[PDB]
Amino acid sequence: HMLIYQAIKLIAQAIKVIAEAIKAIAEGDKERAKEAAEKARELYEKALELYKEAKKEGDLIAAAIALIAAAIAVIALAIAAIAAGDKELAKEAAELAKEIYKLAEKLYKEAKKKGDLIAAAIALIAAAIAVIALAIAAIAAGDKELAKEAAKLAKEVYKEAEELYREARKKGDLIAAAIALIAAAIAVIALAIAAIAAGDKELAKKAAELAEKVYKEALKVYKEARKKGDLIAAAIALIAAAIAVIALAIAAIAAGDKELAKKAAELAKKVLELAREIAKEARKKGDLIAAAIALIAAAIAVIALAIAAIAAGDKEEAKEAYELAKEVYKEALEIAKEARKKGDYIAAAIAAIAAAIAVIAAAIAAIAAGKEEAKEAYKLAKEAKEKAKEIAKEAKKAGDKIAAAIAEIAQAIAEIAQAIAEIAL
C-alpha cells in the first residue's frame, strides 16, 4: 500500500529528527534543540493524520506503522527536551506519548479481535515505543511520577505482548509471535529506562527478570521456526532476543549489578552467533531477505554487547564489541551488494539497515572504550549513509517504492550513529 509506503517514509523522517536532537545534545546548542522539537511536532501530526486515514480505510498494519512513526517523533521531542533543558517540553512530550499509547492500545485490541495478529503485534510495538518516549520525558522533566507511570504502562504492554505471543504461537503464526516478542522486549527496555528515571533498583531488577523471559521465549520461537525451515520467522525471533539483551544490559546499569552486565554480554554473544549462522544458511539458499533480517539481529546484539561493556566498565570488552560491529557491518554490505546485483532491492535495503545499526554499535562501543575509534565510527557512519542512499536511488529506478523507503530508514539510522559518534568527539 501507498499507506504502508507513506508510513515507512515517516518512520525514516522521525528517526532523522532523533539524530538532530542527539546532535543538539553533543554540541550543546539550545537553538538546534528547539528546531528539532518543532520538526518532531510536525512529523507527529503527519503520522497522526496517516494513522487516521489508514484506520478509516481499515488498513490496520499501515495505521500501526504510522503510530510507530508518531511514537518515534515523541522520543525526538523528549530527547530535544533534554538538549534544551526545557521541562515544559518534556511535559508536552509526556502527554503526546500517552496519546499515542492509548491509540495504539486500542488499535491492538481491535486488530486482535479481527484476527490480524501481525497488525496487533506492530500496534504493540508502537505502544512500547510510546512508553520509552514517556520514560525519557520523565528524565527530561525530572518527574519520578511520570517515571512510575511509564513503569506501569511498560508492564501492561509486556503483559499484552506475552498474551498475544501465546495466542499467535497456538495457531502457528510464527511471524506474528516473533513480532509480539519484539514489542515485549521493547517494553522491557521502557521499564528499564523508567527504573533509571525513577531511581528504583527494584524496578531495574524486575526489568532484568522480564528481559530474560522474553529472551528465552524468543530462542524457543527461533528453534521452532528454524526446524520448519522458516528462516524469516527465525530471524525476526532473533531480533526480539537481541532487543531483550539490550533491555537486560540497561537494567544492569539501572541496578548497578555487574553480574547482570556480564550475563548480558554472554547472551549477546549467543544471539550474535545464531544470527550470523542463520544469515549464512539463508545466503546459500539465496533467501537474501532472511539473511538481511538476520544481520539486523546480529547488529542489535552487538549494541547490547557495547552497552553491557558500559555496564561492566570493561574497556577490553568495548574494544571487542567495536571489532565485532565492524564485522557485521562488512557482512551486511556483502548481502546488500549481492542483493543489488540480483535486483532484490528490499533485501538490499534491509541489509543497509543492518549496516547502519552495526555502526551505532561501533559508535557506542567507541564511547565505552574511550577518541580515534569514535572518529572512525563517524566516518563509517557517513559511508553507511552513502551506501543506503545509493540503494534508495537504485530502488526508485527499479520501481520499488517500498524498498526505497526502507533504505531511507537506513539513511536515518546511519545519521543517528553519526550523532552518537559525535558525542564521543
Author numbering: -1 to 368, 370 to 424
Q: Which text from the study accompanies this structure?
A:
Encouraged by the successful design of sc-apCC-6 and sc-CC-7, we extended the seeded design approaches to target α-helical barrel proteins with five, six and eight central helices. By contrast, the six- and eight-helix-based targets bound dye, consistent with accessible cavities, which were confirmed by SEC-SAXS and X-ray crystal structures solved using molecular replacement. Together, these additional designs delivered the de novo proteins sc-CC-5, sc-CC-6 and sc-CC-8. For the parallel targets, the experimental structures show minor fraying at the C termini of the inner helices compared with the seeds and models, which appears to improve the packing of the external three-helix bundles. However, the symmetry of the central parallel helices is maintained. The backbone RMSD values for the repeating helix–turn–helix–turn–helix motifs are ≤0.5 Å, which is expected given the low sequence variation in the loops and the hydrophobic cores of these buttressing helices. The parallel designs all showed some similarity with natural and designed helical solenoid proteins.
Here we describe efficient routes starting from validated parallel and antiparallel peptide assemblies to design two families of α-helical barrel proteins with central channels that bind small molecules. Computational designs are seeded by the sequences and structures of defined de novo oligomeric barrel-forming peptides, and adjacent helices are connected by loop building. For targets with antiparallel helices, short loops are sufficient. However, targets with parallel helices require longer connectors; namely, an outer layer of helix–turn–helix–turn–helix motifs that are packed onto the barrels.
